[PDB]
Amino acid sequence: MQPMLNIALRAARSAGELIFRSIERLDVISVNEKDAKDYVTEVDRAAEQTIVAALRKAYPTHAIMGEEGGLIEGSGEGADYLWVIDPLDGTTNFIHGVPHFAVSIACKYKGRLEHAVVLDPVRQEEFTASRGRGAALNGRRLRVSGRKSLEGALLGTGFPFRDNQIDNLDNYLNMFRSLVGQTAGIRRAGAASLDLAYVAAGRYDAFWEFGLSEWDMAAGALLVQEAGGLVSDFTGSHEFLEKGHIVAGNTKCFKALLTTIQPHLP
Amino acid sequence: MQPMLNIALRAARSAGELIFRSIERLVNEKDAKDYVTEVDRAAEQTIVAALRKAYPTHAIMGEEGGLIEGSGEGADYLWVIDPLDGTTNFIHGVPHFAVSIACKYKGRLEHAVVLDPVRQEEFTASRGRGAALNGRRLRVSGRKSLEGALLGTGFPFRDNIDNLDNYLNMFRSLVGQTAGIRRAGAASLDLAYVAAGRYDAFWEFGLSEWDMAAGALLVQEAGGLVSDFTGSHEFLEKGHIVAGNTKCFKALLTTIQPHLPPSLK
Numbered sequence: 001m002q003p004m005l006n007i008a009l010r011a012a013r014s015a016g017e018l019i020f021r022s023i024e025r026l027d028v029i030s031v032n033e034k035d036a037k038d039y040v041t042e043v044d045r046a047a048e049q050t051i052v053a054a055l056r057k058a059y060p061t062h063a064i065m066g067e068e069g070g071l072i073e074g075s076g077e078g079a080d081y082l083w084v085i086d087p088l089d090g091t092t093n094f095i096h097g098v099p100h101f102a103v104s105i106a107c108k109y110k111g112r113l114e115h116a117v118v119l120d121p122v123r124q125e126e127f128t129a130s131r132g133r134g135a136a137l138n139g140r141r142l143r144v145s146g147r148k149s150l151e152g153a154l155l156g157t158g159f160p161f162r163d164n165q166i167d168n169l170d171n172y173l174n175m176f177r178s179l180v181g182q183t184a185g186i187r188r189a190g191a192a193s194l195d196l197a198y199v200a201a202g203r204y205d206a207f208w209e210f211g212l213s214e215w216d217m218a219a220g221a222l223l224v225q226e227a228g229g230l231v232s233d234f235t236g237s238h239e240f241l242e243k244g245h246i247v248a249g250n251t252k253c254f255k256a257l258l259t260t261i262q263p264h265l266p
Numbered sequence: 267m268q269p270m271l272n273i274a275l276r277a278a279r280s281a282g283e284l285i286f287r288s289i290e291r292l293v294n295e296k297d298a299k300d301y302v303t304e305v306d307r308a309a310e311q312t313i314v315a316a317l318r319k320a321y322p323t324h325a326i327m328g329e330e331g332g333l334i335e336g337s338g339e340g341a342d343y344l345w346v347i348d349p350l351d352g353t354t355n356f357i358h359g360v361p362h363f364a365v366s367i368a369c370k371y372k373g374r375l376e377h378a379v380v381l382d383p384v385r386q387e388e389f390t391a392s393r394g395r396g397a398a399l400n401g402r403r404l405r406v407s408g409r410k411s412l413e414g415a416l417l418g419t420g421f422p423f424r425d426n427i428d429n430l431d432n433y434l435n436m437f438r439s440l441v442g443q444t445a446g447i448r449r450a451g452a453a454s455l456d457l458a459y460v461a462a463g464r465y466d467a468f469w470e471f472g473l474s475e476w477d478m479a480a481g482a483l484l485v486q487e488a489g490g491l492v493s494d495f496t497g498s499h500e501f502l503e504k505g506h507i508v509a510g511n512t513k514c515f516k517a518l519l520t521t522i523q524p525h526l527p528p529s530l531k
């Protein structure tokens with residue numbers, strides 16, 4: 001409804017239609033191990049081109065930070081706007097044909113989250129927010145869940161590394177373990193932007209993950225904030241975008257989750 | 267597609283439309299379980315009415331209703347119904363859950379439906395006919411190893427550090443090779459995703475027969491392999507299952523046997 005948000009939304013829609021046609025072709029004509037990385041890079045960069053063309057047609061002086069393309073500075077007052085783009089969040093899902101992935105676009109004005117779009121092109125779920133305007137899913141206002149504690153909570157999470165990183169891993173599995181008793185479930189769906197959007201819509205009561213990139217978190221974090229939730233890093237501060245670890249939730253479940261993970265950090 | 271499978275498919279469609287309207291509306295914690303029991307039993311009634319309109323002599327085993335014997339020749343047919351698989355997702359509004367209907371003839375899996383009513387994805391199979399998603403032939407993935415594999419898994423319980431440790435050990439060993447491990451929260455859809463090539467393999471323990479029956483037939487008919495944790499074919503009875511493409515099934519089975527007690531073997 002704000003012109004900048006509408007621009008971002010149409011760019012996400014075009015990218016998502018491209019991604020949807022790609023998955024359709026994938027599902028009938030089956031790429032093998034070696035080709036998978038190259039197919040993903042191709043679809044990623046085609047969707048990013050779609051988005052960036054649409055954005056720059058309206059705001060050519062803005063700064064752009066894409067997953068495929070890196071950081072490109074803006075000029076004049078446009079230098080105060082930074083687009084943070086994951087054109088395809090959930091690439092492993094995508095390349096396997098798992099229908100759970102999103103386009104993720106955030107706009108920051110002087111370093112504050114200003115606009116956000118997370119678009120599931122399969123389910124056709126459009127999560128939007130502007131700073132101080134609240135959040136919507138396909139036009140309906142979003143609210144975080146009301147659950148009062150982790151008792152029976154449904155959490156989201158993820159471990160995005162798939163390396164040797166035995167320190168991190170153990171710590172994570174310790175966090176995970178402490179959460180297993182109270183919660184009704186933990187889900188590992190494979191796209192952090194959709195996990196944050198689901199926190200915002202009330203579908204998850206909270207979410208925690210480390211090892212993320214800015215483009216994975218930016219839009220979904222604004223969604224959670226504007227839906228009435230809380231978002232921070234693992235230490236409780238607001239440097240999640242920079243550090244790559246994030247806790248998001250409704251008020252009570254955010255607080256309980258943060259407390260629960262404290263013993264498994266220094 | 268054979269008339270018995272088409273009957274099962276229409277029953278799943280009606281149940282799924284009911285489930286979809288139910289999700290649309292949703293309410294605090296205490297009432298949640300009663301709402302879910304209501305929707306569960308309404309969907310099961312829908313399914314069972316449709317099935318028995320065609321095969322009144324068949325045996326029926328639903329999650330809500332238990333087992334009812336059949337009669338005559340019909341006693342050799344057993345329908346195994348989960349009317350709503352993935353209730354925690356459902357009650358939270360997470361759009362990942364399915365209706366699961368299997369038909370067994372003399373104890374062997376004969377027909378199968380797994381229906382995602384949100385994404386409108388209809389997984390169908392008959393014994394010796396192969397599997398389809400919305401009418402298109404399904405094949406298990408071609409990946410030759412766990413390198414870059416996407417696996418699926420689940421914990422039905424959370425009462426249990428008896429079980430807990432066991433799983434978390436398995437999990438850890440699998441993290442290096444695979445591209446990802448997923449916990450989506452509906453075993454019937456995890457098996458259907460193995461069948462369609464979306465997961466390269468899947469393992470879970472603590473399941474009920476109605477959770478596994480249809481998806482197991484889907485995997486078999488899509489060219490995959492399905493067994494229990496010991497490698498035998500008593501997954502329906504034991505509640506632990508491994509399914510996958512041929513190589514990733516084999517690798518996953520090998521990987522998890524050393525991390526089990528003799529209890530799950």
Ligand SMILES: O=C(O)c1cc(O)c(O)c(O)c1
Nearest residue numbers: 158159160188190445446447
């Ligand atoms: O193995 C996992 O837990 C995992 C793997 C992923 O590729 C991923 O994006 C994620 O959020 C979780």
